[PDB]
Amino acid sequence: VRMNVLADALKSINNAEKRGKRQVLIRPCSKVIVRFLTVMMKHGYIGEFEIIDDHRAGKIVVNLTGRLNKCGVISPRFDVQLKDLEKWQNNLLPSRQFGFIVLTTSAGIMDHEEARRKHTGGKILGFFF
Amino acid sequence: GRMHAPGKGLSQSALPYRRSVPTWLKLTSDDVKEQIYKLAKKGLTPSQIGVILRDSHGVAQVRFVTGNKILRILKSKGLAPDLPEDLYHLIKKAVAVRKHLERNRKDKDAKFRLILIESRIHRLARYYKTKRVLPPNWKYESSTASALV
Amino acid sequence: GKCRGLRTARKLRSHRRDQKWHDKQYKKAHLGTALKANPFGGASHAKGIVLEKVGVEAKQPNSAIRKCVRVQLIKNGKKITAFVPNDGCLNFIEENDEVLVAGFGRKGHAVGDIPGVRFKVVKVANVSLLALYKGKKERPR
RNA sequence: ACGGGGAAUCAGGGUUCGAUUCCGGAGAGGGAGCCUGAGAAACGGCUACCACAUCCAAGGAAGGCAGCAGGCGCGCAAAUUACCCACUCCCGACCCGGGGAGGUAGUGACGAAAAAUAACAAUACAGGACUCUUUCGAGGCCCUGUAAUUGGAAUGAGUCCACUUUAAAUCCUUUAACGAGGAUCCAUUGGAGGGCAAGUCUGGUGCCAGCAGCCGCGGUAAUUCCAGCUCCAAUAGCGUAUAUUAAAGUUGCUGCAGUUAAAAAGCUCGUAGUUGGAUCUUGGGAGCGGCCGUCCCCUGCUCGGCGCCGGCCCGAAGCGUUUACUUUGAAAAAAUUAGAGUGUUCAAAGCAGGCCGCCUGGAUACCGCAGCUAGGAAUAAUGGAAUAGGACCGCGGUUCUAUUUUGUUGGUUUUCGGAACUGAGGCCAUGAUUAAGAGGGACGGCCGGGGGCAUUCGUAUUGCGCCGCUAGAGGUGAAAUUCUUGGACCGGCGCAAGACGGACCAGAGCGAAAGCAUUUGCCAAGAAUGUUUUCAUUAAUCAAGAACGAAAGUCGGAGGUUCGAAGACGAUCAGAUACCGUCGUAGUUCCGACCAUAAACGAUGCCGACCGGCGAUGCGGCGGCGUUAUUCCCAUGACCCGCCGGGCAGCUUCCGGGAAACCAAAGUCUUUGGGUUCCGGGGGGAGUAUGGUUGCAAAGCUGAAACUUAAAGGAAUUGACGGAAGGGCACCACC
RNA sequence: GAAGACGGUCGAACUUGACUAUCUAGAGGAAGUAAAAGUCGUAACAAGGUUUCCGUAGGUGAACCUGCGGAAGGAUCAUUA
């Protein structure tokens, strides 16, 4: 059954951008998807999106550029110290010059670069480049 | 995907967006509850109550009209059954199958469908014991089952 | 891996532990049967006593006669056909001589043309068979 | 297998090692018992036994090197029966004695660091700069290289006086003197077909000898053997065998595979295991830089200091959903590792050192997990009120209890504090998130070779009887066995039994799979669709355990039509225990009980999401011109044209993948992580031996090793080949 | 206050038998693997001259053959109202 809702989302907008779609419906919705997307938006990877409120879990409709090469989930949500976060961006991003690991800290769901300057580790959610 | 079938059916009931009551429905929440009591006294389940209501009396959802839902209206006053209607219906079906299978030992398909129904029971029993709406001492035994109508 | 649960450490370790036994190189080293049935008893080299000089017919293709030496090992009393290296070095091996005997190179597997001979003769009467072949040491008799 | 600190390897993960100098443990040939002492179950103490062994006047006595040397033995495998308490420390009554602890030499290519085996000139020579020449040649002012050519200048290997070193010596360092041209004061070890750096040289051998990790070389021009010359590589080292690490993404957490190369359980249920939908705080107040940035605030009630006419602002305790997580803090032997400083002459090392008595070092980092501490509260679990024994309030009742209290001293119950039992009222906006393109259950009209029980039918087959007429019939590539004038085969009417359900019948349906097809009835069951029904996370997959499970086969009945393992023949054949033919027992059928296996196949686990197009079909639903039937409108069937869901499929596409064949899944994979079960690790040996277990048996489930091997295998291409298909040519073919 | 004895206790050892972990001897049997050229055939690969293969039976000098059900990895993706 559906277990990692953030997996369904990121794979669906990855599939869609590979196909060259201008926007994509992602048809379950969680607050964790919405925080992840806002992080991808702040770095300009995806376009300004839209959360459709039915009275169940939402549906989101995500405007896409051709900037997002790949977004993806790391399942399971492994715990990451500030020590380990080099070895993740070492093996999980395509360079040091770009790409962002999203990881849910206590401070909030955010990129690896802000998790450095805030000096807070946490659980790796995914990554995008 | 179904529990005990390969079936990937999508025959779901689909409630509308607007939880807000319609205009035409003149019955107040109290007279709906009074009619729910009248149906429960006749000897109907919250499933059968809800059907009879939305058909003949134009009341889509009792939860929309009132605050609460049909079992919780039955349960508050004490018209609700001791053991849930859905676990009743599986035990009812298991007693029906087992009676058929008393004189039909050749019917191997029946025997397999019995084991599937037995598994549905044990599965629901286990759920309701976590919610203590059945006693922890309760366990569906097929020899004790014919007394549970 | 085919179970990426965060709480699956033992299934992943206990599977790997079980599936390492289906490897040859592991099963060999991690049972007594390979280390027991080893004629050398897990040793690199072994002194034994020549009990006959044996011609072994080379393999199917190429066809020489490979001059090996039937050896009673001291430590075990076990029987070994051990090859003698370079041209005309079976002339240096009198019968009932204590020979130091090594492997052939393939960790107890048969090498080249020589069927079921896993060993070479290194020294004969505690004098090196390279030194006898080069003529540096003379055979003490 | 003594554990650990640690060691090797090493992208990141890891893998292997740790007997071995520090920590902790254990034992003194094996067990056992105990004396003394603060401390021992001590063994350079004692007491037995066991094993072994010494001395003996044969009565007795003595023994414990897994301390330092040394010996035997065992082995592939490991050093002197040396000097010394001077250093380091330890013991003692002790500045004084003692220490095989320790130190110093000896042996020492385990290993690590530095580092000789020549340098320089003049000449012949040759290559490269330049005036110059078509080419040659000239010059060498500039270079660079080679010749047992010649020439001095060198410095230590060694030899060796002395000092220094040191317990006394040694080595090192210092330093008189000797000490080099074939600098004979002589560099090896392995290679030279490919991988793999370097000869298609010469002489020998002739599938021999041998080489060869693998592929290969060797049968008379050997690039591979045996040598010569030559060249290459590492170099005071280099080869070999074996363990082990990387290479191995060939154990795969990072990160492998499972249609066909090895591989998905026959199928399903199912408990632990693992994984699990969405949802519960946000806006602004205070301030700065040039609309955007960085900060402080958005819980409450006993003890005193920036103060005030009992309390206001604030300081310090103590209660405060519970955990994982992250960040910080405490704490965590050195030695090792990283690492700071520092000219051991450099370096490995060392912990020292530096300055014309002074100054300075002996830092620091890391120390998984578990434990302790304090911030953060995203993510994940868990919680609280739903017959109300629910909060927040003040009140009235009841059992036991600090005394401030009668000027100091005789009897009390009280307020007061403080804790239980319990009655009413008000107050809370009084308490239940939603109803998943998750799931169960109810409901509705359907649907289907779904299953069971019964009933019913149909030819046909075989046998039997009757009637007819005739001599053949069966059977085969050809015959024969078999039947047959006692009438077979054939034709007609019947009868009986047992199988089986043609055609309709489909890339159609149903079933978990195995499987399922005459009619009709009963019985329970089921998917799909429809739903503004209900429950509200109940779920996904699954060690244990379990149901069903073709055919054959086993046991006990019933029946035996056909067909037919074995067998009897008859042919073919060289043989023919086979293919062909005629008989034919078990069996095939039914009932009860086993058995649990198939190429049980889609050779493709299940669940979920996403990513193309097309026309079909089956089931349900919904909508739309028209034709037809129940004709008398309806409304239902039958067609017709669409749409939606679910299913079996098909075609098509550079979605993408794949070794390809191919796959809308086998895709969404180095841009590698949705959940989970089973399972593979070169070919054989082998699904064998052995043990267990299930079975009456046949066998099934679990299941090795030795040993053997350089391939076995997959897909595709080209060719040859066919006792495959089609086309074409030829009087070396036919007509 | 010595020997010594009774009893207890720890308990080495010894005798007897069984259970049993490893190693070794074994008449005979029955396998497997390896050889350059042994004998009988020709089962398999071409429709391999009876298509091959799976399961399960029985049989036979041997590869094998035959029954029953299954598979295409078939020699047909098709065969016409």
UniProtKB/Swiss-Prot annotation, chain A:
Sorted keywords for this record are:
Cytoplasm, Nucleus, Ribonucleoprotein, Ribosomal protein
Role noted for this protein: Component of the small ribosomal subunit. Part of the small subunit (SSU) processome, first precursor of the small eukaryotic ribosomal subunit. During the assembly of the SSU processome in the nucleolus, many ribosome biogenesis factors, an RNA chaperone and ribosomal proteins associate with the nascent pre-rRNA and work in concert to generate RNA folding, modifications, rearrangements and cleavage as well as targeted degradation of pre-ribosomal RNA by the RNA exosome. Required for proper erythropoiesis.
What's this protein's family per the entry? Answer: Belongs to the universal ribosomal protein uS8 family.
* InterPro entries named among the record's database cross-references: Ribosomal_uS8, Ribosomal_uS8_CS, Ribosomal_uS8_sf
NCBIfam families hit by this protein = PRK04034.1
Cell location: Cytoplasm; Nucleus, Nucleolus
Q: Which organism is the protein's source? A: Oryctolagus cuniculus (Rabbit)
> In its UniProt entry, what is this protein called?
Small ribosomal subunit protein uS8
BP GO terms, sorted: translation
Residues modified as N6-succinyllysine are: K87
GO terms assigned for molecular function: structural constituent of ribosome
Domain of life, source organism = Eukaryota
Q: Does the keyword Secreted apply?
A: no
Q: In terms of one coarse class, where is the protein primarily found?
A: cytoplasm
Task: Provide one Gene Ontology cellular component.
Answer: nucleolus
Lineage, top ranks: Eukaryota, Metazoa, Chordata, Craniata, Vertebrata
Subunit details for this protein? Answer: Component of the 40S ribosomal subunit. Part of the small subunit (SSU) processome, composed of more than 70 proteins and the RNA chaperone small nucleolar RNA (snoRNA) U3.
Query: Cross-referenced HAMAP family, in alphabetical order?
Result: Ribosomal_uS8_A (MF_01302_A)
Swiss-Prot record, chain B:
Query: What's the source species for this entry?
Result: Oryctolagus cuniculus (Rabbit)
Residues that bear N6-acetyllysine: K26
Which residues are reported to carry the modification N6-succinyllysine?
Answer: K26, K33
An example Gene Ontology biological process: translation
Family matches, as InterPro entries? Ribosomal_uS15 (IPR000589), Ribosomal_uS15_arc_euk (IPR023029), Ribosomal_uS15_N (IPR012606), uS15_NS1_RNA-bd_sf (IPR009068)
A Pfam match: Ribosomal_S15
The modified positions for Phosphotyrosine read Y37
Q: Which family does it belong to?
A: Belongs to the universal ribosomal protein uS15 family.
Gene assigned in the entry: RPS13
Q: Which GO terms describe its molecular function?
A: small ribosomal subunit rRNA binding; structural constituent of ribosome
Summarize the protein's role: Component of the small ribosomal subunit. The ribosome is a large ribonucleoprotein complex responsible for the synthesis of proteins in the cell. Part of the small subunit (SSU) processome, first precursor of the small eukaryotic ribosomal subunit. During the assembly of the SSU processome in the nucleolus, many ribosome biogenesis factors, an RNA chaperone and ribosomal proteins associate with the nascent pre-rRNA and work in concert to generate RNA folding, modifications, rearrangements and cleavage as well as targeted degradation of pre-ribosomal RNA by the RNA exosome.
The Phosphoserine modification is found at S29
- GO cellular component labels: cytosolic ribosome; cytosolic small ribosomal subunit; nucleolus
Gene3D superfamilies, alphabetized:
4.10.860.130, S15/NS1, RNA-binding
Q: What is its main location?
A: cytoplasm
Q: Which location does the Swiss-Prot or TrEMBL entry give for the cross-link Glycyl lysine isopeptide (Lys-Gly) (interchain with G-Cter in SUMO2)?
A: K42
Key words of the record: Acetylation, Cytoplasm, Isopeptide bond, Nucleus, Phosphoprotein, Ribonucleoprotein, Ribosomal protein, Ubl conjugation
Q: Where in the cell is it found?
A: Cytoplasm; Nucleus, Nucleolus
Q: How is it modified after translation?
A: Ubiquitinated at Lys-26 by RNF14 and RNF25 in response to ribosome collisions (ribosome stalling).
Tell me the residues linked by Glycyl lysine isopeptide (Lys-Gly) (interchain with G-Cter in ubiquitin). K26
**Summary of subunit composition and partner proteins:** Component of the small ribosomal subunit. Part of the small subunit (SSU) processome, composed of more than 70 proteins and the RNA chaperone small nucleolar RNA (snoRNA) U3.
Q: What is this protein called?
A: Small ribosomal subunit protein uS15
Swiss-Prot record, chain C:
Q: Which portions of the sequence form the region Disordered?
A: 1-25
Q: Which residues carry this modification: 3-hydroxyproline?
A: P61
- Location within or outside the cell: Cytoplasm, Cytosol; Cytoplasm; Rough endoplasmic reticulum; Nucleus, Nucleolus
- Listed GO MF terms: structural constituent of ribosome
Q: Where is this cross-link: Glycyl lysine isopeptide (Lys-Gly) (interchain with G-Cter in SUMO2)?
A: K36
The Gene Ontology biological process terms listed for this entry are: translation
GO CC, alphabetical: cytosolic ribosome; nucleolus; rough endoplasmic reticulum; small ribosomal subunit
Main location group:
cytoplasm
According to the UniProt entry, which residue ranges have a biased composition of type Basic residues? 1-19
Q: Where are residues bearing N6-succinyllysine located in the sequence?
A: K53
Q: Which keywords are on file for this protein?
A: Acetylation, Cytoplasm, Endoplasmic reticulum, Hydroxylation, Isopeptide bond, Nucleus, Ribonucleoprotein, Ribosomal protein, Ubl conjugation
What does the similarity note say?
Answer: Belongs to the universal ribosomal protein uS12 family.
Record text on subunit structure and interactions = Component of the 40S small ribosomal subunit. Part of the small subunit (SSU) processome, composed of more than 70 proteins and the RNA chaperone small nucleolar RNA (snoRNA) U3.
Official protein name in the record: Small ribosomal subunit protein uS12
- Lineage summary: Eukaryota, Metazoa, Chordata, Craniata, Vertebrata
Q: Which gene encodes it?
A: RPS23
